[model samples]
Target: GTENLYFQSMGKTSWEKGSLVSPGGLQMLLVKEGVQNAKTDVVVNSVPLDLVLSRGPLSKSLLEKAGPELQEELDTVGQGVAVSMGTVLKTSSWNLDCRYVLHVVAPEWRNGSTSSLKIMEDIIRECMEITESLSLKSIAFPAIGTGNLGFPKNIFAELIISEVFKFSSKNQLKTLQEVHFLLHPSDHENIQAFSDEFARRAN
Candidate 1:
């Protein structure tokens, strides 16, 4: 089994569109993507949750559009979460296209603190580690820490690409078999940044 990392220029969400195949192996995509897309896996955008957006109850598309049952699950799990706990929550995708929504953690983008980057990196790995632990393949990731907090998208972008290598470097993916890096349609420069860093490091 080989690890195939894909780069997608998306219209909106990756979950809504999941039928494509990897270049290295059509069989893997067809067999898995065909069956899995009915309800597949992650789209790891390091931009992060509306959780830090508030703390009342999980809102936004992931939770709001997700319907009430998923909220009930989060309720049962208990929700006194702190940022450092940097917890990853798993719940039904519900109204969403994906079968499971691995609601992972996110860090608030600090201006220039080294600990800020540390917190950011910790959350990213925590999310990745749990997905591996669950054996969930096919993660669609955005440039990490490129959030609006002004963390310098280029540096954040490079960190995400390298971390994927660090995480899946040689395991033939006990981490994951397939991965993706997605960028918004509007960010003309962001895609270029992610692509350049990916090209520089992933080769």
Candidate 2:
């Protein structure tokens, strides 16, 4: 990916998944924009391509109910977040249009032990396998187990970026251009610093 190949926007939604400048090659799936409303057809490409990693037992039930709707929106473009709910996480893809919602179970957080971190890495590796099975490129991630789950921001950032790079190195995943980490900056400096540090180290 060239400098031009990368696209950055502050508080803006980029719907066209095409390459940063061309808006044509491969489409990058948009994040956090899918609505559960049935009347509107959810674009499979628009449906988040990576795990929208959420924590809690309720995530399964929530996604199970929404799975049908999600399935209705799939396409050649890979879609839907790989949800890791609890200990019994499994892949149950159910889309007439698409085919995969890898449900994984990352451990609930503890004091300093990374039991959950290990789980997070395991589930992500499995998801890479899912992507390979589908031959799909690109996946986006929200900071997993962060919101309401009480993962400290610094730890969350370190764990997530490390996992992403680690998997990317091993997977031999090609054309799978982006492993996007979408963050909400209720307080901008937090995300700004995260991004800056990520770029500094990653670059």
Candidate 3:
């Protein structure tokens, strides 16, 4: 075994996984890594556009849920932020619990036309870089692209876990202590996929 990629699970939502009151507990949210939508305490927004022409209904809905501060920020300066496929940005957490959000960008899969896997890998690495740089202690991630972007859940699971390992292996994660993949309880297959990959790698 090269490194121990430890993972655990609970019958709870990503928001319910950990306590927000704990000392030194810095929680983060990874939803495909978008730039807006204060869906979680620490919202990590993933920007895949040169200019955000319009947010999808889901993104819009989440932004509304995130409340006025985040909505105002997006309205004021969200479009000015430009990012390529593998890069990331940071912004105010607003009404979210965490201090801030690390906005990451991942390219849409063009029917395998691009090196989409590598792009995703880089996105994950970049997110980790931002996390370590900010000295964030804890972060939670949802399976990117599984909902609206339509990436396979199994592949998403594999990529996220493996890329975390790949990044953690080479970099010194001084500030990052806990990383979590927050999956829905109904998505058992993806969870099992990550578990199987974790087991295979640990062997």
Candidate 4:
């Protein structure tokens, strides 16, 4: 599956994008790129970024247009896996140093969409694994799919946050400190609701 390949390729240090939320007043780790000893309290761009732009809900062609060279560079930084963990690879004309933009493909709204959902879940789990394997302490994510997949925003929020908490508990790794769900200038209500629920669950 793509998630497995994605994780394996990330090597010890890589970051893709996801939603980073403050739930229960705690941070979440959605993307971890070369962040050793990452702190839960700081913002994503605060430190030097190993991760690239959080290009949410972009089409394949759009991604290729965004930053192709930099995105390819990430693929060359190969990391190990039990098998090969493939990443969501795209090329872009946009100039960026990180190289090789990677982000999970969300479902297209037609037919039975569970396969896409599960794939999305797999991507999250693989990302967390990569972070653990690399010994990264924190990450940041943006809300997946709500921007383009036309998934109902509330349901999308519930599905992702639930997965993050579930995966974190299952791994029980000291390598993770927080999973941040970074919101755009918009999305106030949905982001806030997720945070409230996250807090409720944490306690």
Point to the candidate with the largest TM-score. Answer: 3
Quote the lDDT for 185 in model 1. 48
Q: For every candidate structure, what is the RMSD over all alpha carbons to the true structure, in angstroms?
A: 8.1, 9.7, 8.0, 12.9
Tens digits of per-residue lDDT for model 1 on 128-177? 67667777865555544554556677777766655555655433545356
Give me the runs in candidate 3 sitting further than 4 Å from their true place.
1-43, 47-64, 75-80
Clashing pairs in 1: 39-99
Winning model by lDDT = 3
Candidate 3: lDDT over CA atoms? 0.53
lDDT of 2 by residue, 1-203 (tens): 11112223333443122122112232222122111111111111111224342323234333554564433332222343333343222333443122344343455567656676676666655655556556665454445455445566667666755665666555555455554444433424335434544443433
* lDDT (tens digit, per residue) of candidate 3 on 42-90: 4455444542423643344335545666545554554565545665656
Q: Is candidate 1 or candidate 3 better by lDDT?
A: 3
Off by over 4 Å in 2: 1-100, 185-193
In candidate 2, how many Å is residue 132 off?
1.7
Superposition TM-score, candidate 1 onto the true structure: 0.64
Candidate 4 per-residue C-alpha lDDT over 89-182 given as tens digits, one digit per residue, 9 for 90 to 100:
3232243232223343445434437775675567666655655565656544455555555555566667767777678656657565666554
Clashes of each: 1, 6, 7, 38
Candidate 1 lDDT at 148 equals 51
